[PDB]
């Protein structure tokens, strides 16, 4: 039994329980961004930019 580098975990989610009782729920958007209700999300990025719940109003790049 030797185990060279192993049994690793990167960007891992487990054993999650969730209840969400909500009577009324409204989202009103006029331009821009809305992100609501992200749960149990796992991600691994290599040589790149990672974003899970990112909201931006607007990205202007003129010249």
């Amino acid at each position: 039994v030797l185990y060279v580098g192993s049994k690793t975990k990167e960007g891992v989610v487990h054993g999650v329980a969730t209840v969400a009782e909500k009577t009324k729920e409204q989202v009103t958007n006029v331009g821009g961004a809305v992100v609501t209700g992200v749960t149990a999300v796992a991600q691994k990025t290599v040589e790149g930019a990672g974003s899970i719940a990112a909201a931006t109003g607007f990205v202007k790049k003129d010249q």
Copy 2:
């Protein structure tokens, strides 16, 4: 039993339980972006940009 680098987990989700009782639910959008209700999502990117729940109003790139 030797186990060179193995038994790895990257971007993994397991064992998730979820209840969502909601009476009324509205989403109103006039331009822009809305992202609601992302659950149990796993992703692995190599040499690229990762995004799970990303919202942007608008991307303008003039010249």
Copy 3:
């Protein structure tokens, strides 16, 4: 039983329980960004910028 560098955990979430009873819930957005309700999120980035719940009104880059 030797265990060279192993049994590691990076960006890991487990054993989470959550209840959210909410009668009324409103989100009103006029430009900009709103991020509400991120739970049980794990991420690992290599050679890149990480962001979990990032909100920006607007990104202007002129020239």
Copy 4:
């Protein structure tokens, strides 16, 4: 809209979510009783004895 006695609920179960990851599971019985794993069970009894998960080793009634 009058609603004489109505909209009642008696012995009711709803909105249940469950995960059960189990590698090995053994049950060994030599006489007696074993009850394992009762979930999401509803019952209504009138003029009688109710029992959901009842175990008895043995019922002797001599004379």
Copy 5:
């Protein structure tokens, strides 16, 4: 809108979320009773004895 006695709830379960990760699980019984793992159970009894998870070694009634 009058609502004589109504909208009642008796013996009710709702909005339940549950995770159970278990590697090994053994139950050994030699006479008697074992009850393991009762979840989300609702019952209503009228004019009778109610029991949800009842275990008895043995019931002897001589004469």
Copy 6:
């Protein structure tokens, strides 16, 4: 809008979240009773004896 006696709740359970990570779990019984792991249980009894998780070694009634 009058609401004679209504909107009642008797023996009610809701909005429950639960995680149970357990590696090894043993139960050994030699006569008697064992009750393990009762969760989210609701009951209403009328004109009778109520018991949720009751364990008795043995009930002898001689004469």
